[PDB]
Design an enzyme around this catalytic site. Sequence first.
Site, PDB file in Angstrom:
ATOM      1  N   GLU A 187       0.860  -1.182   0.000  1.00  0.00           N
ATOM      2  CA  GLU A 187       0.000   0.000   0.000  1.00  0.00           C
ATOM      3  C   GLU A 187       0.901   1.239   0.000  1.00  0.00           C
ATOM      4  O   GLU A 187       2.005   1.212   0.536  1.00  0.00           O
ATOM      5  CB  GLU A 187      -0.956   0.014   1.199  1.00  0.00           C
ATOM      6  CG  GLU A 187      -2.068   1.052   1.096  1.00  0.00           C
ATOM      7  CD  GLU A 187      -3.088   0.800   0.000  1.00  0.00           C
ATOM      8  OE1 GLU A 187      -3.986  -0.042   0.203  1.00  0.00           O
ATOM      9  OE2 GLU A 187      -2.979   1.445  -1.060  1.00  0.00           O
ATOM     10  N   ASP A 207      -1.800  -5.208   1.096  1.00  0.00           N
ATOM     11  CA  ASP A 207      -1.267  -4.073   1.879  1.00  0.00           C
ATOM     12  C   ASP A 207       0.178  -4.336   2.347  1.00  0.00           C
ATOM     13  O   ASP A 207       1.014  -3.430   2.275  1.00  0.00           O
ATOM     14  CB  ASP A 207      -2.211  -3.738   3.041  1.00  0.00           C
ATOM     15  CG  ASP A 207      -3.540  -3.150   2.596  1.00  0.00           C
ATOM     16  OD1 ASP A 207      -3.563  -2.457   1.574  1.00  0.00           O
ATOM     17  OD2 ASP A 207      -4.544  -3.407   3.260  1.00  0.00           O
ATOM     18  N   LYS A 242     -14.531  -8.667   2.795  1.00  0.00           N
ATOM     19  CA  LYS A 242     -13.195  -8.710   2.212  1.00  0.00           C
ATOM     20  C   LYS A 242     -12.842 -10.142   1.812  1.00  0.00           C
ATOM     21  O   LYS A 242     -12.279 -10.339   0.744  1.00  0.00           O
ATOM     22  CB  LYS A 242     -12.135  -8.158   3.169  1.00  0.00           C
ATOM     23  CG  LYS A 242     -12.022  -6.641   3.164  1.00  0.00           C
ATOM     24  CD  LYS A 242     -10.664  -6.110   3.539  1.00  0.00           C
ATOM     25  CE  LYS A 242     -10.564  -4.615   3.348  1.00  0.00           C
ATOM     26  NZ  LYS A 242     -10.310  -4.278   1.929  1.00  0.00           N
TER      27      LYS A 242
HETATM   28  O1  LIG Z   1      -5.670  -1.177  -1.692  1.00  0.00           O
HETATM   29  C1  LIG Z   1      -6.867  -0.801  -1.732  1.00  0.00           C
HETATM   30  O2  LIG Z   1      -7.294  -0.312  -2.778  1.00  0.00           O
HETATM   31  C2  LIG Z   1      -7.752  -0.886  -0.657  1.00  0.00           C
HETATM   32  O3  LIG Z   1      -9.001  -0.343  -0.876  1.00  0.00           O
HETATM   33  C3  LIG Z   1      -9.954  -0.324   0.120  1.00  0.00           C
HETATM   34  C4  LIG Z   1      -9.683  -0.861   1.373  1.00  0.00           C
HETATM   35  C5  LIG Z   1      -8.421  -1.398   1.625  1.00  0.00           C
HETATM   36  O4  LIG Z   1      -8.160  -1.849   2.741  1.00  0.00           O
HETATM   37  C6  LIG Z   1      -7.483  -1.405   0.602  1.00  0.00           C
HETATM   38  O5  LIG Z   1      -6.261  -1.920   0.854  1.00  0.00           O
HETATM   39 MN   LIG Z   2      -6.360  -2.657   3.027  1.00  0.00          MN
HETATM   40 MN   LIG Z   3      -4.601  -1.793  -0.100  1.00  0.00          MN
END
Ligand SMILES: O=C(O)c1occc(=O)c1O
Ligand SMILES: [Mn+2]
Ligand SMILES: [Mn+2]
Length: 180
Positions: free
Chosen positions: A64, A92, A118
């Site tokens: 991320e 991430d 998720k």
């Molecule tokens: O990386 C992402 O795009 C992302 O988007 C929404 C929630 C997340 O935790 C995330 O990593």
């Molecule tokens: Mn995330």
């Molecule tokens: Mn992310």
Amino acid sequence: AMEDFVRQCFNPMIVELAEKAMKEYGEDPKIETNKFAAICTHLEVCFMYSDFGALLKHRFEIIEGRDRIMAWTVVNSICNTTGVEKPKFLPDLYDYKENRFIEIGVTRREVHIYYLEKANKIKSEKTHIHIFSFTGEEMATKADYTLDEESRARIKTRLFTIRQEMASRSLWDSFRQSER
Ligand SMILES: O=C(O)c1occc(=O)c1O
Ligand SMILES: [Mn+2]
Ligand SMILES: [Mn+2]
């Protein structure tokens, strides 16, 4: 606005990063303010997590917050020289002690609710999920919380503080009801 609070309450690296993410894809941080806040918040957790980690220096890898060229470059680098399958989405973090990717979730809902959503979006992946609320509630796949409690206390507190700062400015109720 919200915008002010965000500017006041997050280190510039995080703000700059958030803004570029939104501006790249045609979204205005002056308008989609609650979203701005949420990006900053998630990014900060992602960083805090990877900070916490005397023998395995640099336990985590941050995906991320990088651009997608660098991101996939990092992901691909890790896949080639460990064996671990390639994730469909960019997650991430990568964890070198337990040799698995991590998807970090932060939610103003219930943790088991967000967790499911998720796990449904990444069903095909062996990715560890860890979910933090603004209530000191977490949830992690197979309840393996990866971090020591000290590190998790720190994160929970940061989030709770963000909540109470927002609440303090009458920003929380907007924010709370704006997820997803
Ligand atoms: O990386 C992402 O795009 C992302 O988007 C929404 C929630 C997340 O935790 C995330 O990593
Ligand atoms: Mn995330
Ligand atoms: Mn992310």
